[PDB]
């Protein structure tokens, strides 16, 4: 129900919380550049020669 941010460990009956996920948003935005730039050169090379 998205009320507890964590996961359950069954082999050791643990409850691992989510005191994690530092400010890595940068990385995803960085990935965004790739997903554009590749396509960009794909358009540049496809002009002709």
């Amino acid at each position: 129900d998205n009320t507890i941010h964590g996961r359950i460990d069954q082999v050791n009956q643990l409850l691992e919380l989510d005191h994690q996920k530092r400010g890595g948003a940068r990385y995803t935005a960085l990935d965004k550049w790739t997903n554009q730039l590749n396509s960009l050169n794909q358009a540049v090379v496809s002009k002709l020669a």
Binding site: W33, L37, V44, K47, L48, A49
Partner: protein
């Protein structure tokens, strides 16, 4: 230091802008004359703002347009109510007879005006701004008003300091030089401080100065506090930062070589091969 003069970080920038405007307008730098306004609280004369004046020339002497002074006074008595005349400023090196000729006319306005100096051809590390007062000395015959140096401070208020910080942060010869010269000057004078400390330690060892047993202990602690944070975690974090910035630079060199490539393709698509 006789009377006490408090100086705000506003008149200096106005003088600099006036001189720059004059130099751009006429090419050859000449003398610029302004008027000081502020608050005279007892012996403490606080100079907040200054306004330029139009000064004419007759024969070989500069005369202040006194009617222009009255009109300007009536003008700023409405925007700055409790501000009175304090003196005049000038640009140049050592005082010259022209400055005395201007100040003798200025004295007819206010009994004891101030004298401000700002060297634009300065080649030294000192502050070009200086403060002087006219004093009638014991010179034989008609004793002239000699300009005696005064003790001036850098009193400022919150808005002035914050604006100065904003301007200092803001900023040709390539941006890398701009980013590098600020580091260079800071390291230069930090090294000068270090050299002074080492010189005192050497002098204390030589016995020229009396042997003080308090400074040497703090110096020893400082000596023991050079190798800061040589742990492996710091090294790992620093190398992570370096790699991240390197890949940033890669992604951004590639997008510019793409621009160059597109420009080349567009140029080539019309010369050797039509359509």
């Amino acid at each position: 230091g006789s009377v006490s003069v408090a100086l705000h970080p506003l008149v200096i920038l106005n003088i600099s802008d006036h001189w720059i405007r004059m130099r751009s307008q006429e090419g050859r730098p000449v003398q610029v004359i302004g008027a000081l306004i502020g608050k005279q609280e007892g012996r403490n004369i606080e100079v907040m703002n200054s306004f330029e004046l139009l000064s004419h020339t007759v024969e070989e002497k500069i005369i202040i347009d006194k009617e222009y002074y009255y009109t300007k006074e009536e003008q700023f008595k409405q925007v700055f109510k409790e501000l009175e005349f304090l003196g005049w400023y000038t640009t140049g090196g050592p005082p010259d007879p022209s400055d005395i000729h201007v100040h003798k006319q200025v004295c007819e306005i206010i009994e004891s005006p101030l004298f401000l100096k700002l060297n634009p051809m300065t080649k030294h590390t000192d502050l070009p701004v200086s403060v002087f007062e006219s004093v009638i000395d014991i010179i034989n015959g008609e004793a002239t008003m000699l300009f005696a140096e005064l003790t001036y401070t850098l009193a400022t208020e919150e808005a002035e300091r914050i604006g100065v910080d904003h301007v200092a942060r803001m900023t040709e010869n390539s941006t890398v030089a701009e980013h590098l010269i600020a580091q260079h000057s800071a390291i230069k004078m930090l090294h000068s401080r270090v050299k002074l400390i080492l010189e005192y330690v050497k002098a204390s060892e030589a016995g020229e100065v009396p042997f003080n047993h308090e400074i040497l202990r703090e110096a020893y602690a400082l000596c023991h506090c050079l190798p800061v944070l040589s742990t492996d975690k710091f090294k790992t974090d620093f190398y992570d930062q370096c790699n991240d910035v390197g890949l940033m630079a890669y992604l951004g060199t590639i997008t510019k070589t793409c621009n160059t490539m597109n420009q080349f393709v567009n140029k080539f698509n019309v010369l050797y091969d039509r359509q």
